[PDB]
Amino acid sequence: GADAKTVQDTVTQVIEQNMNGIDNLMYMSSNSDSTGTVQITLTFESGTDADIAQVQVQNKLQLAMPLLPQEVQQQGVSVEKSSSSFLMVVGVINTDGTMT
Amino acid sequence: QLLAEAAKHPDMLTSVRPNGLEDTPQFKIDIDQEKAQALGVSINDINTTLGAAWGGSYVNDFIDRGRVKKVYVMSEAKYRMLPDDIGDWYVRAADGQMVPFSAFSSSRWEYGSPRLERYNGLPSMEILGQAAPGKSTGEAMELMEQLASKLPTGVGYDWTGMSYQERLSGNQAPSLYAISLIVVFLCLAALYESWSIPFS
Amino acid sequence: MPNFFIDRPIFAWVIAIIIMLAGGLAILKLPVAQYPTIAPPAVTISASYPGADAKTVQDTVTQVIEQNMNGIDNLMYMSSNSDSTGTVQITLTFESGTDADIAQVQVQNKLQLAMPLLPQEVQQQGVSVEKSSSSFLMVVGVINTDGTMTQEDISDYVAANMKDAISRTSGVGDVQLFGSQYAMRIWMNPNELNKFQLTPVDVITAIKAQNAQVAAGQLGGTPPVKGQQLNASIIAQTRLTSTEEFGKILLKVNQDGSRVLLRDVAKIELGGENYDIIAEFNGQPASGLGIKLATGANALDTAAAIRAELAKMEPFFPSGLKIVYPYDTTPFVKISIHEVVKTLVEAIILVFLVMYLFLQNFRATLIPTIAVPVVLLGTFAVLAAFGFSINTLTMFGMVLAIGLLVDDAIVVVENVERVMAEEGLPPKEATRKSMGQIQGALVGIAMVLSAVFVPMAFFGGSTGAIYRQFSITIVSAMALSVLVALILTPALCATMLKPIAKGDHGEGKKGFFGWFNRMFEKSTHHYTDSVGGILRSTGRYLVLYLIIVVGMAYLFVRLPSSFLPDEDQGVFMTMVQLPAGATQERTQKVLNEVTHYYLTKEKNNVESVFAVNGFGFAGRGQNTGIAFVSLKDWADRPGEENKVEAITMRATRAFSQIKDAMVFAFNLPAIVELGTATGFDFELIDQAGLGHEKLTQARNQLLAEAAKHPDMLTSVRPNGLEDTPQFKIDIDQEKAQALGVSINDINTTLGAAWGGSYVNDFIDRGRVKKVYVMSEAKYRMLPDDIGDWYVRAADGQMVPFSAFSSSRWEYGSPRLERYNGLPSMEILGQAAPGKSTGEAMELMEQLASKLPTGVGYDWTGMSYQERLSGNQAPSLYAISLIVVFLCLAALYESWSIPFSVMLVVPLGVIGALLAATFRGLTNDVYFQVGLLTTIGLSAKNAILIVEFAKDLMDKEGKGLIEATLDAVRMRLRPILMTSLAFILGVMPLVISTGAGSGAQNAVGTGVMGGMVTATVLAIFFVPVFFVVVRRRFS
Amino acid sequence: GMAYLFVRLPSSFLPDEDQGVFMTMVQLPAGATQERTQKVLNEVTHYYLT
Amino acid sequence: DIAQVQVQNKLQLAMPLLPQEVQQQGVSVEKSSSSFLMVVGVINTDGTMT
Amino acid sequence: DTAAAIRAELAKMEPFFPSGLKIVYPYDTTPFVKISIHEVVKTLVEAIIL
Amino acid sequence: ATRAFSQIKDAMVFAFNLPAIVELGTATGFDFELIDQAGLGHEKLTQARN
């Protein structure tokens, strides 16, 4: 329930302020949505240990966690290895038409 | 301006589009707190009413067929669509009187970005496009950066994702060729014990 | 193998080219830092609970966090401090080699699960887990020369405009703001609050209600009606933005209709989140950014990038804003690296000069000039491969290994030239014969030097980390030198050297060179005659060798020990400690006096003073302060009296006359990450819940007992604060209930007024900033001001604090310490002069054994490492001796001949000690590694002599005495010329007196003395050992 | 001639393949509702299936 | 180590949703064997402690 | 190694125990491991002798 | 011990030795899981297990 500008000021900038100084970080791209979502991707160099990169990103994020609004902590800020492409889509239909 | 310039080159660039959303209108609600206190309606009650009715409020969990699921309270659609539906929602006062939102609230229209993007910590916008049939992606990137060089001051560019890898490969190709040639030359000199055969 | 490359010079050239390319790539890619990771990994948990004393923080925060630090791997120990400023710091120290990231994430995760157990205020302020095992690469301060900006303004500007871009700079690992952003400060007036029957609770509630973000919803949101066309997001109450908006917050409306706003009962401004620390640069308000170097980064490049970025920022600064560098050790690092590189280059040039002086051949002099740089580049490549960086330890290790490198090159080239000038063979066959003579000896020397230097890498702890740099560097350089001596150098000798006649020893030359040749020939004849005379009476010289060994033991025992020399790094520190209960103003006056002294009485030596009033060492309060004094360039400070040593002692002597303040000026440690080399660190543990008072009594008893042993223990002092007066408020709860006053309101009013309360955030210029409500300073200074504060009752009447509470003065700890989860007190000391640290620790343990029941002890810091690595050296060096003996037996095919080599070890060592004894140096790391290199060179010379003698005895019918004489004759020249080259190369280090002169002198003095005595003694002691051994076992 | 050919040869990264699947992105103007997007999506589905 | 890190990174998302009483007791994430390495008991020979 | 560290910690604690308190090891499999490995070493030595 | 404790009518009492490796268990044993995978409930799962 927050504007993109407000969530960017309260969440995105605060988080990405401390995302510098991480090993083998090629670049970073973030976006802030009108629904209050903040999505920050840190792309590292090829051959980097993704587990170590995730641990370092967690270590850098925990410095900013107290500076985020209480509702953000309540919703939970997740740090995890990510991919940008779907391996597959598994759809489910109803051949009888009885299910909406 | 960059997109307009890119549209002028249909023979090289195709389907050049921005990977983002245009600025959307937003409905600003101004809740006057002193009027609410004068009418005897708590500000927390007003906030809860507005958020729950229009935005939906997650209350707590229940059990559906043995699975924990969420319970949501939200306004029915017909009372939630248009800006003039705000008047149908009332809030009880300390004395039990039901006060309308119009009695203590006003509204207006503004504009704002629904999705703000940043690259390397600076505001940015992502653009997507293809190379026209018969053209390569390298030529497309060359034309794109040529067009971007003619933008106002303080507006730079960069390549990301696939284009970043393509740029890196192109940049490091000549050094790869030189190093491989030197390695083969040294290997030949070592094996055949001569500087003549390596050069020949 | 040498024969393979003599016939294939181009293949050897290809190998050399590959080594050179690898070394160049490493040099372009190696990281550069002053020192490597020496301290054990350490993780600090910092939390703040504003307005609380040490005991409140300890009971509500420190103990709760400590009780949940379980299941974390490789933890050596844990310590914690809880200060009267409301701050708790918990340092967890892990075993060396522990992954810092894994330890940090484990600590943070165990703290995540303990977060719900902490007070809501601690959770709101946030608990930060950081890696404290590193130090600042640089400090960039920002001042205003116009006086238009306060400290808070400069800090806010730095946070908003400078910090982000500096953080984005390449090679920057962490940026810490020396200040804080703006905060919405609400300074409440108790009189005005009582006028309108308001309390701080009302202000907090109003701020929370009227400064918030409310989720509103969405127009046409899903699920929509069947004909919806418009979808828009609804915006509602948002955070306030300016002081005007906060001042307009409405607290109440009176019956007459007059409105009470926040501006009426409080002053609204943009201040700082905290006011404990006041930073000044030469008396002007200042902020700053501390910049830490990233892992694997180049310090010089990072500093250059930071300075370039600051220059880019400069044109956009407000009028009067200026950038300064209060603490910058990067110039010291640059000058040190330059000095080491220059030392290497001049060593190569001096080797060239000695080659030309002795051989009188130009193409002979080129061969070492090609070999040595190749070995150095290969060493750089090897260091890059093993994940090492270019630091002081590795660079000085390379400097030390120059001796062995030049020795190998000189041995090969000189032996080839000698064969050419004796047998008259052309270069190729002479090179073949020389390599056939020396190849096995070179391989054995490689094995022996590996045995000598590898055991250094297996020491434990921080000292082990320091000796592993030297071990790896010197071992890699030695291995590459030996490989080059078998691959490239023989090929160069075969391809480049011109033929020499069968009997040309240079006497036919004219000028200086002919005279030099004749002089050296007659000197060699005299030396051989004297050696024969010695071998006729070996017993007297065996007695002399026993005397030498006894003197070596004498000097080794009486040589003081140390870790690293102190350096004049262009900066030092001055700590001021005022009496308990002193305020910020008094500490500021003391700091201003210190700054005036430094900028007037030392204006030719001091560039700036960075006075930080608010925290010092082992404490943080209004009665402590620290000043960071930066010195001018070493070029501008010529002479002994203008260095950090003399300047600091003069400053301390001048400050000794300051009253009501203990002020001490001192130099930085060699490695700031560890304040080691200050004796022993001791922990006195409350093991039975005795309490703070009984622990204080036990500590006092221990200190009194320690004072009774001045001959063993010196300056045994507590590393903490004594109990200070505290103002106790006893709230009578029955009275509070009787008058209708809730205890929650009473406590909230008291804490918010006198301690300050963080309420919520607000958006200033697109940044979140905290909102604080505190009493205006006028009304929270003295006990009487307690009577100015009222609390509203349920009946609506404002009751004063005097109606339901009494007050008194008690004593309490302003700083509570814990070690390994138990209450503790830290005691620092050092052994008396002439006493070792181990025996001082033993006496401390004996004294502690007689302390009251329930009081234990532990050793932390450097004492813990000393107990870990105390007995390692003798065992590893016994293994080294055994391996060296086995390698020598393999080389010589004899069980006894090895001894004739192994006896050379004292001959060099004694000299080093003498050089260390006369110059006043100590047994530090540099001295020990230089001693090892001298031992290696002496062993190399003895090995070559014994190899030549035994080859003469075996492959020819020459006798023991005749073979020994001919061997010493053949080996005299290379020994002398190598010793001359190395001594001349290390002369600058001995004579150095500028920047980095401490380490340079430590490295050079021992090397000089050991080389001189080894060259003088071995040349007629090794033949004695060989002859005696061959006579006994035959 | 080799240098001339090298300089004029266009560059890319990897050839595009026919993987049996592709995507179609649809973006309506700002403020458009789910029903209009569904209408546009129904058109795209019709195109591919007719 | 990494398994525990990932498990706790997923658990801190659920932690806010757990009952406050559960949080006050302390949720623990551990990586240990299912069997006791040892049992260290404590008695009072004097019999003066319960 | 963990058992040895635990024993060292208990040895550190023991001097400060209240009078009568005493530690026991009702369940420790370490002695079995020690004796088994020692027995295998003894069999190796005896095999060399034989 | 098991034969003697079989006479205890108040409880199921079994004495047992641990295996060489605790986790491996018995070489002829199997561990089986019956899953309620249609939202049947606890009672229907109990009936299926019976």
Ligand SMILES: N[C@@H]1CCN(C[C@H](O)COc2ccc(Cl)c(Cl)c2)C1
């Ligand atoms: N955050 C507070 C506020 C102000 N800030 C001052 C810093 O203490 C700067 O003082 C120095 C200067 C040099 C070094 Cl090397 C170090 Cl460690 C500290 C502290």
